Amino acid sequence: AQINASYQRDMAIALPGMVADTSKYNIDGACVVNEGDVLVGAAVQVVQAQAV
Amino acid sequence: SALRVFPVTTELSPTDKTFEYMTFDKVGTAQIIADYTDDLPLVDALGTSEFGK
């Protein structure tokens, strides 16, 4: 008759801006985007830190 | 007129020689945070006291 077939596909490894491992890590979540837009997988700069 | 125009209490026992009362306080703050945040401020407290005879 016919011969059946079976395939295989592997998923990707990562996506931009994704935490890789579960090692010691620290996110600062008290920051505001002062001007413009920020991409997910890119570095940032600190314009000014408020005093009070 | 001294007991008439000022309150009278009964806290102290006959044998006591002194007494003491205390006050308290606090400090703290808060901020606007995001989803994955490990940065959160803290609070504390203080206190004093005085005496009599």
Most B CBs within 10 Å: which of A28, A32, A38, as the mutation test of the B interface?
A: A28
In A, minimum Cα distance to B32 occurs at: A30
The alpha carbon of residue B6 is apart from the nearest alpha carbon of chain A, in Å, by: 46
Separation of alpha carbons A25 and B38, rounded Å: 10
The answer to whether B25 touches B47, Cβ cutoff 8 Å, is: yes
The answer to whether B46 touches A37, Cβ cutoff 8 Å, is: no
Residues of B whose CB is below 8 A from A31: 34
* Distance from the first to the final alpha carbon of chain B: 23
As beta bridge partners, residue B26 has B45
Handedness of CA B33, B35, B38, B44 (dihedral sign): positive
